Amino acid sequence: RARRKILAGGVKCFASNNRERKVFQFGGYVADHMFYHHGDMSLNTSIIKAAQYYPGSSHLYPVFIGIGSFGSRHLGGKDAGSPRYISVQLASEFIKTMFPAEDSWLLPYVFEDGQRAEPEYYVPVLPLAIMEYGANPSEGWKYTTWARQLEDILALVRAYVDKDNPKHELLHYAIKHKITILPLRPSNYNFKGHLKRFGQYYYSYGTYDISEQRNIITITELPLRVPTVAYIESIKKSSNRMTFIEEIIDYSSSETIEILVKLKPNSLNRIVEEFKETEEQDSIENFLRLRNCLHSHLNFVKPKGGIIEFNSYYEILYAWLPYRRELYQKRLMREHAVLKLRIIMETAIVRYINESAELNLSHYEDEKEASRILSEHGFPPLNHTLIISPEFASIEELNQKALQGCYTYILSLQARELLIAAKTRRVEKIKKMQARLDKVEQLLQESPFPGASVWLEEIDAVEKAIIKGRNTQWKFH
Amino acid sequence: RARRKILAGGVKCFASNNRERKVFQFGGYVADHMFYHHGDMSLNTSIIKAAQYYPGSSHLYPVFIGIGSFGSRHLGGKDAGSPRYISVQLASEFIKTMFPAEDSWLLPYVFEDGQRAEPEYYVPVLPLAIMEYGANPSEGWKYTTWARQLEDILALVRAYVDKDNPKHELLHYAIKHKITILPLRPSNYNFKGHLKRFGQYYYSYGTYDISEQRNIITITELPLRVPTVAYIESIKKSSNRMTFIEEIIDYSSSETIEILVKLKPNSLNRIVEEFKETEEQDSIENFLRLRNCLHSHLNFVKPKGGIIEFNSYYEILYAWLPYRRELYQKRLMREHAVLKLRIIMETAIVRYINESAELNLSHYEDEKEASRILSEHGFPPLNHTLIISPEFASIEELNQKALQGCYTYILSLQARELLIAAKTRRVEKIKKMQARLDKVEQLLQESPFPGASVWLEEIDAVEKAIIKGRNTQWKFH
């Protein structure tokens, strides 16, 4: 959607350098290049929604580095500051690990009006469609979904990649029968409460502290995805519950949650005699609206177009994995296909120096008979500036336009390129890149799927960026 | 002075293209590069003073193309418009003919604070110190001088350059004896009046029309360098002359001069009986203040610093000519000195191709023994990027840093540069530039002074630009 359009903005604008840039200036850059026609206000509110960093925000891991204060959990991110004064900084450490730079050249790009457009879907290292809560990037309709923890999806992806996990074939066994033996639990970050499961729904409950010595009721934790100001007004609506409430004063603050509630003890003995004495939970969390109903609404973009609904989050992770798994194979094969062309081009230039002024002379090179005469000389007619600089080209298209290439990679070199020292660096470039070919040849041949070993390293790289961001003051340095 | 600082602004800013630019934007460019620290207001009023185009203006030929209206002859150029709204355009046709581009590399540049500064004086094709009236580029003190016509200085410069003029040695004879037989007269552009000479001063007089049939006095032409509004208030000061003036109403307008004066005929018979009956001129131009005293004030910048005063304008033209004449010799000698170095460099590369893979091989070129081994090979050790790209270097400095040059003009060429077709274009480049050397060698050898023939062509080029500007609507196209 529009989120992916903003994603290409950070990497393209900050390709030269990752410095501090204004939000509106970056927004103007994004619409200038990727043709954002929905207005800068819609772009600016989407940038903040993409870069929101607060408990309860939809985006747990922002694409960009949070600068200044974008709000607080009280209003649920609706108290954003002035876009003009605030600045935006791309998180270069996370974005390259989460989205590999080399994989971007292979991503399926659509073309609109004869120009490239952003991909329909991205296939990152970890699925961004589950790690983030639902939100309202547009107006009117709001998508509602709940994120899973960063320990169950990690165990699931490592089970489908690493062979060392004992439950490797067990996960594969569950794929065919759709039994889903492995667990999968909601996010628990910045929620010191409880989560309880009956039937087919979840409910989040807060924490309250009761002290007999001082007869003061203390509320510790809020529900999972509630703004603070919402609970203030919701408790005032019920006239029946207002009679029991003599007074509620909020003492909670930012980075320090402590609420003092003065409730008469004589009201404690009569609340339970008229609230039917629910046995599922205590009356303290029943009289106080400290619960929310989690109606799982699942939406995933269809590859062919449209929207799909899944009964559980397992069907999303079990569907996101194969598309990422498939493109690991294509990434290595294309890189394999370009290294072998580089060996052909480099060796020809190295061997050209042997048939240069060292031993032989063929300087005449009339453009008419240079075609088939040089054919028996072994010099390949491959086009230059493509092998050294690969582009958004598929494996099938790469071979067609490389074999039927053109000259000027030969006999257009600098006169020093055929000197004795230059050949030594040129010939030694082959073996270093020949050894890299061997490792890739050694890869892409495992029984489960190609590129399994590199997947684990990429998974760890994502974890390194997330840990460093949280360990530091969200500075990544 | 500050005028020459603005001069370099137009050529440098409009080197890429000659388009329409705002006056203040150009002023910011000038101060940014040539370090104008007198303020933009002083710069802006100097730009308009440099680009003023109206009868009576100090600058007859503006450096830039006049855009819009900068005022009128009524206020004498003090009614300039808003600098921000008006635009400035460099007159590329005139400026290159008046100031040769190639001569700029040889002009004496001073260095301040380790950086280049504008030349102390310029030596253009025609002397700008006489063709323009005096003005007040600064505040407080105003320089007063009167320009000569564009037919007497042209006859004088052609007499000192062209041998076909019968009064060639006559001018040279007048130089030693300071007799100045040749004439020299003031400017007569846009002045349909009279100029009269007694003693050692000039006086400009207007034209009046008297009709007996209608008994209406008509004034046709104003004095040479008078604003229209000055004459309105000056005639009101004299109380004695106010009695005779029953009423004066100005009917003159822009591009149409016609003034109706109603004077009673009975006052005509009594003005002459009390004004002493001056015989030098009629009483009509005596009662009406239609004359001005031309006190010749001559100021010329000293080459060593200071100001000089000359008794006549002849001493200025007879002093400006030798400095321009001297630098014609230096311009050709430097261009002669760079063509002969270009022949050495190009022939070596052409002959290098002969000792390239065609016949001989010397590709080893160890950096230690390439010094004296290649010395017997005839390859000159001249530094590249200097002959092909000359800079602000004198003839004496050019030879010192060219003979003691460096390599990389050899054996760093493209491999196609030693191909058979490339040598043909390279060897034929020698003879075309050898023929140009012959003409320069044929020049700089005349008895009067070097570069006499090119001077006449440059003089005509200046005349072509001036004629085209006046023939068209001051558009030069």
Residue numbers in the entry:
A (entry chain B), B (entry chain A): 716 to 1192
Text taken from the publication that reported this structure:
However, for these theories to be broadly applicable, they need to be demonstrated for large and multimeric enzymes that catalyze complicated reactions. The enzyme used in this study is a type II DNA topoisomerase (Top2) from African swine fever virus (Asfv), a dimeric multi-subdomain enzyme (271 kDa) that catalyzes multistep reactions to modulate DNA topology. The domain composition of AsfvTop2 resembles that of the canonical Type IIA DNA topoisomerases (Top2), including the well-studied eukaryotic counterparts, which form homodimers. The catalytic process not only involves well-coordinated changes in protein quaternary structures to allow timely opening and closing of the N-, DNA-, and C-gates, but also ATP binding and sequential hydrolysis that relate the dimerization and catalytic activity of the ATPase domain to the mechanistic steps of the cycle.
We first performed the cryo-EM reconstruction of the full-length apo-AsfvTop2 without DNA or nucleotide. The distribution of the three primary co-existing apo-conformers is approximately 1:4:2. Even though such differences are modest energetically, they do suggest that the closed state II is the most stable state, followed by the C-gate open state III and then the open state I. These thermodynamic properties are reflected in their structural properties described in the following sections. The results from the preceding section suggest that, even though the global conformation of apo-IIa is very similar to that of EDI-1, binding of DNA/inhibitor still induces small subdomain reorientations, yet coupled with substantial catalytically relevant conformational changes locally. On the other hand, as shown in Fig. 4f, the three ß-HPs and the catalytic Y800 in apo-Ia are farther away, relative to the corresponding moieties in apo-IIa, from the catalytically relevant positions in EDI-1, suggesting that it is less feasible for apo-I to bind the DNA substrate and undergo functionally relevant conformational changes.
